[PDB]
Design a protein around this ligand. Structure first.
Ligand SMILES: Nc1ncnc2c1ncn2[C@@H]1O[C@H](COP(=O)(O)OP(=O)(O)O)[C@@H](O)[C@H]1O
Ligand SMILES: Nc1ncnc2c1ncn2[C@@H]1O[C@H](COP(=O)(O)OP(=O)(O)O)[C@@H](O)[C@H]1O
Ligand SMILES: Nc1ccn([C@@H]2O[C@H](CO)[C@@H](O)C2(F)F)c(=O)n1
Ligand SMILES: Nc1ccn([C@@H]2O[C@H](CO)[C@@H](O)C2(F)F)c(=O)n1
Ligand SMILES: [Mg+2]
Ligand SMILES: [Mg+2]
Lengths: 229, 229
């Protein structure tokens, strides 16, 4: 009943900027931001900052981070499905990233960079499979919007936002994440364990230009994509 | 419908020995062993040994271990509830430990020994609360059997079994775990977040003497305890 659309993109590509203009185009649209605040101030439902711990020593903290990040995403996405959107006329829920980018882009890249060992990567995949088996269907996607930007543009945008934890991220790391996005969503050559994803419709939007000038043409392309689903 | 009973006890107190004689006293009784094999050979559903990793460097690996241990226990306990025991006449399921000892004895002791930091302990408790909120009621206990033995007796029994990963465990560690068992199950002064546990019936059995001589009197006490539930 609720249509579910994931907004995917590299660090600082403009997912939140792009989301912050959606709700005003239709009252039946809702957004689930990445729960970054559960990540920088770890609290039970002045805590530790597990995002910062991972960037300071990724070989120590990537497994713990990646596991918490994805559990907290599932909880937030489930809370939105089962809230007041449930009773609108033509409901659409836009997710800032998905459980699929958690595993196939970020967790995978850290394992390949030796920031998780074989044991951690096995436990992580086991946990991910199981959590999706319990909640997979309620969260299944109807479509994906890819906000495509160069790694160099992303590096400039990290500087523009000034989020403290991200200021040390090097271009080399953003470029690794870029090539995983391109494999998954442009070339569609990245293989996953979730067969339906190979056919899910994708809308690719180039967001390298200034948002102020590109806004109107982006909106039209989104409105048209959504008509097809 | 299924009565659920947890067998609790220190490392090498005799839980498996005690369990290995239950099924022969009644065809409607079943056992869920601690899934130690998922722990010493980590495999998706020749892997790493996460039990050994924790004992070699507990400050590095306790969070990862404790989280996997408890997820794997819940999965194994749920698989037994939803299997063929479901359709017996007077079904009883005996669990080798519970999600409550995972947190209030083992994970808690590691945090107090600085083998998990504040961030890890917060994430762990959050995960535990949430997992029990989804599966708590199906796994709720009707009774507890405490197999009580001195830490010194346990240390001798580690030597008798010869499980490779346990041979380095010092008496000081077993004694910490002993005093947590005594607080929870003898004195009943250990406070948890699960109000019903303070009234769950407990049968305490002293198992310091040789099993061969004590067997018959233990069985009678178990049969009588179970009549009361
Ligand atoms: N298309 C764009 N043109 C100019 N600035 C942008 C554009 N997209 C994002 N920004 C800016 O770049 C930074 C990162 O944007 P943000 O939406 O926080 O990215 P994300 O949510 O993808 O991490 C912010 O300073 C934001 O104003
Ligand atoms: N009451 C007992 N008397 C003599 N040996 C015991 C007794 N209980 C356990 N054992 C022995 O002690 C070791 C540990 O027993 P086990 O059942 O594996 O403990 P647990 O399951 O609690 O770790 C084994 O060698 C076992 O034969
Ligand atoms: N599975 C995920 C998801 C996101 N992130 C990181 O979270 C920060 C906020 O987007 C960004 O710094 C980030 F995207 F990289 C991550 O490391 N792993
Ligand atoms: N939550 C738990 C449960 C058990 N264990 C450990 O597992 C081994 C097999 O009982 C024993 O070495 C052990 F009991 F200590 C643990 O460290 N934490
Ligand atoms: Mg954002
Ligand atoms: Mg045992």
């Amino acid at each position: 009943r609720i249509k579910k659309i994931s907004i995917e993109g590299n660090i600082a590509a403009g997912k939140s900027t792009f989301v912050n203009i959606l709700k005003q185009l239709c009252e039946d649209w809702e957004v689930v931001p990445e729960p970054v605040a559960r990540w920088c101030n770890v609290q039970s439902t002045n805590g530790g900052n597990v995002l910062q711990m991972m960037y300071e020593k990724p070989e120590r903290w990537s497994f713990t981070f990646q596991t918490y990040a994805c559990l907290s995403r599932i909880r937030a996405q489930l809370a939105s499905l089962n809230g007041k959107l449930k009773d609108a006329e033509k409901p659409v829920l836009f997710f800032e990233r998905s459980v699929y980018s958690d595993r196939y882009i970020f967790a995978s890249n850290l394992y390949e960079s030796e920031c998780m060992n074989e044991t951690e990567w096995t436990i992580y995949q086991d946990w991910h499979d199981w959590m999706n088996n319990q909640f997979g269907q309620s969260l299944e996607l109807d479509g994906i919007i890819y906000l495509q930007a160069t790694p160099e543009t992303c590096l400039h945008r990290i500087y523009l936002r000034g989020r403290n934890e991200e200021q040390g991220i090097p271009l080399e790391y953003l470029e690794k994440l870029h090539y995983k996005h391109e494999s998954w969503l442009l070339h569609r050559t990245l293989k996953t364990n979730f067969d339906y994803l190979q056919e899910v419709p994708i809308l690719t939007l180039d967001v390298n230009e200034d948002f102020k000038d590109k806004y109107e043409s982006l909106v039209e392309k989104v409105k048209e994509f959504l008509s097809t689903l």
